[PDB]
Amino acid sequence: KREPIHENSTRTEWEGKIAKLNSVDQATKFIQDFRVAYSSPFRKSYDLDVDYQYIERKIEERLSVLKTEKLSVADLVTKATTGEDAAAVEAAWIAKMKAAESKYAAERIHIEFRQLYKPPVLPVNVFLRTDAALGTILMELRNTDYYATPLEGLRKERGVKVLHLQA
Amino acid sequence: CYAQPNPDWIAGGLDWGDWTQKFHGGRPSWGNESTELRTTDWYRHRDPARRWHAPYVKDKSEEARYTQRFLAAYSSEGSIRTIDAYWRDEILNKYYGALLYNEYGLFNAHSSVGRDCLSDTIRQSATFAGLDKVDNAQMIQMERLFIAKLVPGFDASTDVPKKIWTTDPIYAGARGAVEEIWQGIQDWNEILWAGHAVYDATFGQFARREFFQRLATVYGDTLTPFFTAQSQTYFQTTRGAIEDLFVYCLANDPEFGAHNRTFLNAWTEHYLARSVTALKDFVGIYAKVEKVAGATDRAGVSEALQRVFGDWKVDYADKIGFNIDVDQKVDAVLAGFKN
Amino acid sequence: CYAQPNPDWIAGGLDWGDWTQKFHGGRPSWGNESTELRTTDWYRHRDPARRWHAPYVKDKSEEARYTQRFLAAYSSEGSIRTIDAYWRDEILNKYYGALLYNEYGLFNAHSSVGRDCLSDTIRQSATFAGLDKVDNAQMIQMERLFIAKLVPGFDASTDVPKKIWTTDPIYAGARGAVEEIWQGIQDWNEILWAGHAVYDATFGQFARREFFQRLATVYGDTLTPFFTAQSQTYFQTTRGAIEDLFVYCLANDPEFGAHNRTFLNAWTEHYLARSVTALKDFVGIYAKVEKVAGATDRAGVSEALQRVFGDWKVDYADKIGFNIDVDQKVDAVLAGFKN
Amino acid sequence: TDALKVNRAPVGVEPQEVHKWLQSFNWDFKENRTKYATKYHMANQTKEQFKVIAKEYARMEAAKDERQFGTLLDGLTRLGAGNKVHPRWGETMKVISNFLEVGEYNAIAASAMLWDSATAAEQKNGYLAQVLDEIRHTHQCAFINHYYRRTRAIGPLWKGMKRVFADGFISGDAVECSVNLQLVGEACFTNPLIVAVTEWASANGDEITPTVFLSVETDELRHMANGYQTVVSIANDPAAAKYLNTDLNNAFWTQQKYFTPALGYLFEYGSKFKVEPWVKTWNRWVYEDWGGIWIGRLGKYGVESPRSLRDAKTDAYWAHHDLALAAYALWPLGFARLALPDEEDQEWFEANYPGWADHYGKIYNEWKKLGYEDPKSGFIPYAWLLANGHDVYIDRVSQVPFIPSLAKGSGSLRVHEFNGKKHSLTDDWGERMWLSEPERYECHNLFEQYEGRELSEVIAEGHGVRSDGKTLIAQPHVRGDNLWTLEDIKRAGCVFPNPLAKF
Amino acid sequence: RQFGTLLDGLTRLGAGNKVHPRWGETMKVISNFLEVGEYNAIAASAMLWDSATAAEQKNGYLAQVLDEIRHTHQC
Amino acid sequence: PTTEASRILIHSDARYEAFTVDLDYMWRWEILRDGEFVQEGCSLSFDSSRKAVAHVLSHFKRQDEAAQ
Amino acid sequence: SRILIHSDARYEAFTVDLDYMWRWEILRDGEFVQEGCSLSFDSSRKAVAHVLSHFKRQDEAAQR
Ligand SMILES: [Fe+3]
Ligand SMILES: [Fe+3]
Ligand SMILES: [Fe+3]
């Protein structure tokens, strides 16, 4: 069973607990857990599949207003909402990505960096150039010998549970 | 007005679901991470000029055909004969050409804007804003190639103007401003706001209006005003749309206004400084200019600067609650007057 | 364009027999009595621009719409603020409006031409040349009305310009010339030739290009060049047609070429004389403008006069074999110059 | 002397004169490079085929619009009078125009991305010119569609459409997006498509699509040049030998996955009159002309025919008939009125696809018998589908529907489970895309968004009802009699399942 | 627009003939007579422009002069 | 004056003409009616130039046929 | 002072008195289509009817 697409009880109640976030630190930890729980293929749960995108927006909005209400311009410009130096984040995650020994190690680093630091956690400009530099490396690794592994072995590489294979 | 297939998790979107295909990593086709500003409706912007392709292209065509008729008649008149030769060879040919590089850089800042921004009318205004700027650049070069046809020995190659734009201190602060607005950020609201509403409305208006257009009108330059008239018209048309987007639609969003003003003020602070630098470097050009009493000296230059910053205060700064001391900004730039 | 029903007793006709209806007393609907000149074929002229109704109004439409876009942007720029208030209030407003009457007068002279002349393409060229002249007059008034909207107390009424045109000695030579060319003759080749080829090419060119356009770019005037660009483009278009008619077709008619040159030289002598007179009155205006070395001293005006007369010799005099001593004509005019 | 002597011959400045110096407008600074993730570097010296500056662009296009808009108005007033167009094509028009607008809009941003990717001013200019063209044409579509939003998102074809027309153009390596847009999208499918639609539409009395499409055709040579310059600008990059042919093949598969069944459905079921059967067309456009000749001539730069071209051919024979089954079975979710093949439609079909009658012909006949068109029948053919074990799946990657029990095509179901979510894939190239790149491909299909909801409430929420308030935009027939309302759908008691519940 | 429509209209008369033959002839007469009238109206309106003293009344006749010119060029 | 470098005439009847030229990267074609330029296009190859011009002409001729 | 003199599924026509003459206009689908003048109201209607006959002849032919 399901509810309407754009207005339903899940989104309502979630906006409820979202309104009550009252600090940058509370909101930061809220959005990082939420992203980790509900987004990507490595997401913890597909429970909110149909609603997490809208809800993420609402958190993003609440966090961002808190950022303008309580933080200084210098923090808006140079620090992630975790307290860290945004430049140091960019250096550290690019460095991690350049060291990944495999496309599967790369994809996890890239997915997590977005999960943790997507705006409004990192400053947008720092986020977009980091995202882009990671995408480069991830494509350079994934698109090497892209058809060499046969499909059967690729399924194992992904760690997929083959439920069915039409003959 | 409403073609972009935006979902409900982007303010204004009416579709549902995740995108059909994303970037490696997971970047969405379009997404809120593309800008620090927020709104209840990204589709609210309306160009105050109603510029869509058919009118936008129509108008530019008129100016294109008239420009050639005016050039054919101008060379026939011989009116290039009374141009002041120093202004023509030492200031116009060289430093008005270097400004083509400045306008070119502002046009290319729009490229990522046209990819990332979140509404069709903003994509439309952005593109015409950027097309006019490459127009500006091409038009300056058209002028130089025209003068080259009337004046033997006049070199309309871009080599010297490019060397001047890349190495000459007068334009170092400008070149720095443009290089940061173009290739140094990606927030598409920050590109548009810093480029048109701060940098271009102060330095750009000074260089085009206060220096080359104004000074051509005291050195008997009958040719260059025909060209700055187009850049100045394009500036005002673009200001119209920038104003609607950042003042009416964003800094007054019924829910995120104060939010958006915070980022707007921060931005304005950063790029007002960059603007002041560019000007202070740029005002050294008067060292190479023949003196004229109300224009080319400190009293006049101060008046010109008072117009840029004063106008900018009433047209942009006071609308977003940004505090500026025109007098201080004027002084900050005049420190570079070098006379 | 062979649609005017001309009979085989008017040069180049195909119809036969008398007119179905004539003036009381017997004037024909069209006849060689309308002009001193003769030719083997009156339908020989071709406008070098081939500007028929469609392209002639297209081009003017572009100019019209661009003009209003330019004005709305120019008011927004505040560029009026750096103009010499003196030039603005005492020279431009008064003496430039007076110039409108000169243009208006030239327009009217085409009314009899439109009726009397003997070919349909000449009728078309003449009517468009007419229209451009009244356009010139209306555009000058348009600029005056524009300044009145921006500088308070600036009176755009025509009263003072009209008083200056009808009674100020600065324009006496001009008004006489215009009154004579418009209402003092009816040879339609004499109106066209004296009007465009001689008077407007010497005095009109000096007044529009050498005084108001050149001096505006010495006194900080960034508005007026926009309006002289239109009248100067228009002057050059018309000269294209005027030259084709009187030099290719008429002054070199295989059979009446020499015949037509006698009259053409007769006309030029007389109206060149009125032109010098008009220029001699006009140069008095320098005694009330501020002195700028090279533009308003005796050497600047002299060089301006050398351009007008030297240009005119090349473009017209030499082409019908009329002898002008450029230095003598210049010294004639300067005799009215105070300095 | 300066003040007296000068050349007074009339002269202007022609555009190629200003274009000669355009390349030098860019300057070297270390941060001067594209902001987007890419494996390639478009070379800084590459050139543009057309020497057009902004003023010349405006002059040329203002001129076209002059008469083109005049002609378009005349076509719209003439069509506003009579019956004009055949009804079946009358429906295909509304879908064509709605899909075109989506693609022209998203192309604006794809071309902007490419302009950002280039470093030569001239290649930037070329891309810029396509931005402006796509804008001009979306404005043509606004005007058009103004006479004829959340109502198209309801259906299942709109999602596949959104991949090949929208997400494929802008989300990925810019080079891969170029392949989606110019090298495959336009060169292989849409440029041939718009000239062919000109004949088909005209034969059904539609004057408007030929007018709009020919106006678009005026510009396509510039777009195909952009595509070519993508490949050329990167052909000296060692990344090209490593990557270009994988990006090409993957993007070729993305485009053919939707257009191979989609267009054939359009032509053969959305028109009464049939120019020639789609399978012969397909093999001429894609296999011979694009894959043979044109890609052949790109070998100069190290381009090879897609390795998946042969699978694509194997599927081109029945794919559009399979797709048509799905579209017919689901008509209430769409935004146009369908027409079952009539007696000669069937004749033509059997004639050209021997086997059509024993399979699709009989299914549609039975659906007509069971009340496909009768609004009093409470019959929904998707229910008959489930009720006879004929489930419908949605390719997680392409979004194209798949019906394995009824499909005569070449696709096979793969149902995988990853990190607690079941996914259905339908061919060997999509499945590699999703296995290699799960995080690019999370698009929800409609069975997931509408799970266990009644059909009528999904329609109604979507606004797929006429101003009436009860009569559906969608209809199982094109006659003006016996129209279906929300109540008639509700009678069917249709509720969406989870087709992957059984695995 | 009127030039656009005249064009599109003018190609259709071309590939075959949709016009009844009698009226086909009448067109030839009508268009010859039209041309003469519009041409002379140019000069007539210039004479009236010469007759008026008021610049406004002059202007009104001038507009008709340009009008008659415009249509001769359609012929 | 047709050569291996020239444009090529691909249609000619009482009223319509169509040309095509190889431009390496693409082929450019144009259609003329009664000698006047009507429409411009491009194709991947000479072969598809012909097919393209044939589609557009079927449309033009239908327009003409409907004027009688 | 505009007077509606024709109104059907597709065409509308108004006239107005300007004292010296009557100016009429025709709308097709709410789009101003054609302007004209007549000596009187009556001659406005006859003129409008003539043009509407032409416009409808065009509509007839563009279907049959
Ligand atoms: Fe397109
Ligand atoms: Fe295209
Ligand atoms: Fe008339």
UniProtKB/TrEMBL annotation, chain A:
Domain of life, per lineage: Bacteria
Classification via InterPro entries: Me_mOase_g, Me_mOase_g_dom1, Me_mOase_g_dom2, Me_mOase_sf_g, MethMoxGammaMmoZ
Coiled coil: none
One Pfam family here: MeMO_Hyd_G
A GO molecular-function annotation: methane monooxygenase [NAD(P)H] activity
GO annotation terms (biological process): methane metabolic process
Gene field: mmoZ
Keywords, sorted A to Z: Monooxygenase, Oxidoreductase
Native organism taxonomy: Bacteria, Pseudomonadati, Pseudomonadota, Alphaproteobacteria, Hyphomicrobiales
Protein name as catalogued: Methane monooxygenase
Automatic annotation (TrEMBL), chains B, C:
Single GO MF annotation: oxidoreductase activity, acting on paired donors, with incorporation or reduction of molecular oxygen, NAD(P)H as one donor, and incorporation of one atom of oxygen
Domain of life: Bacteria
InterPro entries per the UniProt record, alphabetical: Ferritin-like_SF, MethMoxA_beta, MP_mOase_hydro, Phenol_Hydrox, RNR-like
Signal peptide positions (record): none
Keywords: Monooxygenase, Oxidoreductase
Gene3D superfamilies, sorted: Ribonucleotide Reductase, subunit A
Name of the protein in its database record: Methane monooxygenase
Species assigned in the record: Methylosinus sporium
UniProtKB/TrEMBL annotation, chain E:
Binding, Fe(3+) 2: 38, 68
Binding site for Fe(3+) 1: 38, 68, 71
Ligand binding (Fe(3+) 3): 68
Superkingdom of the organism of origin: Bacteria
Protein name: Methane monooxygenase
Source organism per UniProt: Methylosinus sporium
Gene name linked to the record: mmoX1
Span covered, complete protein: 77 to 151 of 526
Automatic annotation (TrEMBL), chain G:
Keyword flag Oxidoreductase: yes
Keyword vocabulary terms for this entry: Monooxygenase, Oxidoreductase
Molecular functions per Gene Ontology: monooxygenase activity
Protein name: MmoD
Upper classification of the organism: Bacteria, Pseudomonadati, Pseudomonadota, Alphaproteobacteria, Hyphomicrobiales
Full-sequence range covered: 12 to 75 of 111
